[PDB]
Structure 1
């Protein structure tokens, strides 16, 4: 019976070493998942920056265009007034609003940072275990 107890003790100790190895892997997975998610966060911030920049450029361009056409139309009409013509000199002078939208990922970036933090609180305490 003494032998049998030595065997069970041998099994238990071998199993623990493997279980510690397994949980070490798990900690590596958590670390790498966290890193990956942090990289995705960065990419998302960079996307918003460029997308919002492009929206601002579009808005500013449209504003300038509207002024250009207004000035041009004013000039053309004044020329027409001088020429005594029945033809219309008041076309091409205006620009409709084009509905430029913007990206705000504030809520999403915040939740993503939050999950990253809580993920990093999931690490197994291996020293306690093994």
Structure 2
């Protein structure tokens, strides 16, 4: 599920004029147009920051996994952080971040929460769910063996807890096999992370088309304002320059409108992601087909460059 997009900022005077002194003064006659666009872009950026915070900052404390990583045979190595590599990311997290990959007044601001801090939040949530089950999300974290937590989760789906204890080894082996298979599925799948790729590609395409639109002359003799200033006297130049400014302003307004629509969509996606985190990672959901297909036992969060991956 995508959570946040790139925080984009636009320079008005240089975008419209490309750092030309003459038309810069003329742009003032248009009024306070792009105070509104700057305000909208800033609002979108703060909304993305709020989305990331809400999705990943649901836990007040950074729980740490015990050094003795024995959980009744369950193997969370693929999801627990790796203490060797500097990134301190899990194997699945490393695979996810590896699969997906990505001036004339257009710049991208950095997110408030870095990848390391998001990974730290994910590790805290993972440790909480492994060590204390439902408790950490409803108050003080209470220690409990993982086998007992799994038995309790079985009771939530109408299965007597005696099933787990009489089949603890088999269930642990199947869980390990499934966790291992997730890695192979993610690596081999060509478009497993298609949504985050789509978001990044949409952002890049919007930026490129905004940049490419400048070359369009909008019916003018030329698209270079310097040439118009040089070889044309002002009386026949003001009209052409005003037309070019109007065209570029329309393009920028369209870009901001599309950015707002995409921001609303990603806000909805982030709200859904936070709801899923709350009802699957911090608890067991009786809702059908919400925390994955089949009767839900538990979910594990994994960081992504622009979203979150849930192992249901």
TM-score normalised over the length of structure 2 = 0.20
Larger % of strand: which?
2
Larger % of helix: which?
1
